From a paper:
As such, we found that a circularly permuted variant of a cage-forming enzyme, Aquifex aeolicus lumazine synthase, cpAaLS, assembles into a variety of hollow spherical and cylindrical structures in response to changes in ionic strength. Cryogenic electron microscopy revealed that these structures are composed entirely of pentameric subunits, and the dramatic cage-to-tube transformation is attributed to the moderately hindered 3-fold symmetry interaction and the imparted torsion angle of the building blocks, where both mechanisms are mediated by an α-helix domain that is untethered from the native position by circular permutation. While the wild-type protein, AaLS-wt, self-assembles into a ∼ 16 nm dodecahedral structure composed of 60 identical monomers,35 the negatively supercharged variants AaLS-neg and AaLS-13 adopt expanded 360- and 720-mer assemblies, respectively, constructed entirely from pentameric capsomers. Moreover, a circularly permuted variant of AaLS, cpAaLS(119), forms not only ∼24 nm and ∼28 nm expanded spherical cages, but also straight ∼24 nm-wide tubes of variable length. We previously designed two circularly permuted variants of AaLS and confirmed that their morphologies depend on the positions of the newly generated N- and C-termini. The native terminal amino acids were connected via an octapeptide linker using genetic fusion and new sequence termini were introduced either between residues 84 and 85 or 119 and 120, yielding cpAaLS(84) or cpAaLS(119), respectively.
The unique triple helix is not the only tubular structure formed by cpAaLS(119). In the cryo-EM micrographs, short and bent caterpillar-like objects, referred to as “twisted tubes” were also observed albeit at a very low frequency (left). However, introduction of C37S and A85C mutations into cpAaLS(119) to give cpAaLS(119, C37S, A85C) and a modified assembly protocol surreptitiously resulted in enrichment of the twisted tubular structure and allowed subsequent cryo-EM analysis (right). Since the twisted tubular assemblies were heterogeneous, we divided particle images into 3 classes and determined the structures individually. All three distinct twisted tube structures are composed of two compacted helical threads with 0-, 18-, and 28-Å gaps between them. This spring-like arrangement rationalizes the bending tendency. We also realized that one of the four pentamer interactions in the twisted tube has an acute bending angle (P0-P4 interaction). A possible disulfide bridge between two of the introduced cysteine residues at position 85 seems to support the unusual interaction mode, enhancing formation of the twisted tube.
Numbering used by the authors:
A (entry chain D), G (entry chain AC): 16 to 162
B (entry chain C): 3 to 162
C (entry chain EA): 5 to 162
D (entry chain IA), E (entry chain FA), F (entry chain BC): 14 to 162
The structure:
């Protein structure tokens, strides 16, 4: 289930970035940054598509299940629904600008990966999410699949 | 007789119907997002309504294959008034070709009186494995406008 | 319960059955009014606006785990298209045998514009003729013609 | 407890309560009204129609019908029993009990036979078709519980 | 001409003129009376009900019906058209249209699934049963132009 | 009310009463003794094992398990809930609860998956085989209720 | 990677069984048992086969990676190698009888699953592991795959 794997990367990004904003050691050793797999006290946001109802729904349940079993709280989860895969970048950008949310998870399904014609739609979904992560300085997980 | 045959045709299944349908949901979704938050004690779920009343839309269409692109526009026109949108709140802009769709949609999206933008066009020689430059730029141009202006733009284009 | 809420409900038979009820409740309202200008062909088409409309839903409690998905899909489609949650009447019956008789009482009220029937059917070991499955379709069809009121019919076979 | 007579009986009590509240007083808004029948059988009258064919099986289903009613609060004075020679005659007998204003629900019990071919059985088709039409015309619940031998 | 919309349309005109002769006075006698319908659509008001399902096939049949009437002298103003989502609720829409005194004939167009793997269909039979039963009650001719896939 | 969780729960109460009377005082002749469990759940302790796979369905069955017990006279203080990641781990968890002398019955709830071929599913075969062997060795009832997706 | 999933079940069995050996609440509510996803202070044992070197090796690396990233310590991991899939039940039983080890993970690869002939070998691998879990009262994870 890609939903479990994509959600799991979101916990260890909030912890890693929280250590970055803090203060490291006073030298005397090789300073190292590391994120732990605890979702306590973290806020998440989930954006999922509507196309391919049979496939998308099971991926969403993994996202919530990953957070709650890893020590998270279901009260801090926000879910946004979009019509198609084209509307994920615009919806994720609006959701990520909120100060309360720490990470954004994107879920979707792609219908083809063996032709340049459909690569026009598929490329901009990944391209838009990548630009938002660098611009907003907030982690965004790319958890869509293809079939 | 010809006026009856063309008008009796149905525009429910064309891509113009789907493109206009997605714009209505996204327009209401952002209105709820920018509003006040929930009361807590439960997981928040956001979803847009399909009430098209009180919403303004813009449509950009190309001139290539005018016998085919016009019926796609009429499907988009039907969907807006289908769910309760007034016919006076829609704007129509025509462009000579698919290359200049992004630049035309930029002017409409910057207006404060427009809530969503729907783009309709047709491509040529889609049966080739070679990369197409004009087809890639029109798809890339609309994507960047939506992220910069924070306004949803719907992309519906078919290939011959 | 949020996991159940997170499950998508668009596109099922409950969504489709409730969609037709909204259109016909507005289509019949247009026929109740005066005629057109008489300048060309007079084509009618019901609207998808559900503002101020009233609906009734008949559901079978059999297969309680699966019937709720279709019931909630019909409820969602009413609200999602502008309808009010206060104008929905829901009744529940044990099996598909009692769906026609329950739908008749709701359809006879003057405060109801459309009636939606939701249920599931049993598939046997062989594709033989089913008396129970054939009778429920006939009962709802006869009620709509008699009562001058459109009743939608969405069921699936297990 | 698990025979079809018990299951057919249980639908009779809950329908009598459901139709009682449906035509009673109205709601008051502020929520969606939910109508569901109660399993209490107090103050209800019932009628039972049974066929004489396969007397060994039928007597078992009939005994379960009264047992289910009395267990859920019913009274043996209110129930009425009618016996018919065969399955073809159940619709005409059930109509007489349903037209009485002192009867709240009608329960039909019978045993069917396997036909020669998978084609439509005319006797089997008419008994189910006739009972359903009586319920719609008379606006009274009618329970249809049969077992094919 | 080669589609069922052509055939189902012309039956409406000749049946409509046939009913006009019967409503009038009798003949002069002295011979056998033969009542005949005419292929003249002048002065006739019709109604068309079509289903939105299978957009590719239905629209070709609808325009065929419009082509047939105008070719045989039909007038464009009198044509009335109603669209329905599916084939399940065709007769109920025709019921509201056939009971108008201004309407003389009703044409129904629809498309059903292939099926044929079971012994019966629970949808294709009901739409045909509803239209035939409705015509007898209203004493108004309603044609049947529904084609299976 | 009709889910498999309710049906699986009901067997737990009646077995605890049946095994209580079976090893209790003896009979006195003059007839054949008949032993049957009573549906009263008062004074009984239960243990529930549920799998995390398909959390949407499992939470519905689990809620029916407690609801059936408390309705028939049970008390929510006596019931014990244990959750396992999957169906393969149900036998080992059920054995720990059954070895406790404070537990009268053990209820197992899980959801299975369809295999690729009609051949034996090793995961599905061992979960049913393991639970049955625990009941015979420990002389304690164990209820096996699962649904294949 | 089935190695990540099979190893993950081992952490939540040691925590769950540790709560069983303790003492629950003094009533007043519905008593519930639950295991958490923390591998701190736990000991594990891994048994892996030798056949199909290209497939087995990547599954083993997931087993150690699952433990260390979830808060575990690599000093407590014990690994045993066996020639074929037939020798997993006998090796696991010897390893599980040690008092220090809390959980046992089995890794292997099966070559066929669509014939009764090879089902003789495959059934006894699963049958033997199931009996050891009930007899020794110690969790054993069934993490083999088929190809």
């Amino acid at each position: 289930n890609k939903g479990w794997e994509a959600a799991l990367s979101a916990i260890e990004m909030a912890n890693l970035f929280k250590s970055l904003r803090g203060t490291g050691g006073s030298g005397s050793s090789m300073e190292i940054y590391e994120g732990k797999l605890t979702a306590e006290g973290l806020r998440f946001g989930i954006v999922a598509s509507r196309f391919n109802h049979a496939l998308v729904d099971r991926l969403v349940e993994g996202a919530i299940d990953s957070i709650v079993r890893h020590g998270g709280r279901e009260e801090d989860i926000t879910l946004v629904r979009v019509p198609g895969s084209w509307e994920i970048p615009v919806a994720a950008g609006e959701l990520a600008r909120k100060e309360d949310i720490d990470a954004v998870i994107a879920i979707g399904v792609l219908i083809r990966g063996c032709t340049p014609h459909f690569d026009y739609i598929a490329s901009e979904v990944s391209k838009g999410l990548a630009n938002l992560s660098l611009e907003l300085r907030k982690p965004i997980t790319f958890g869509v699949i293809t079939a």
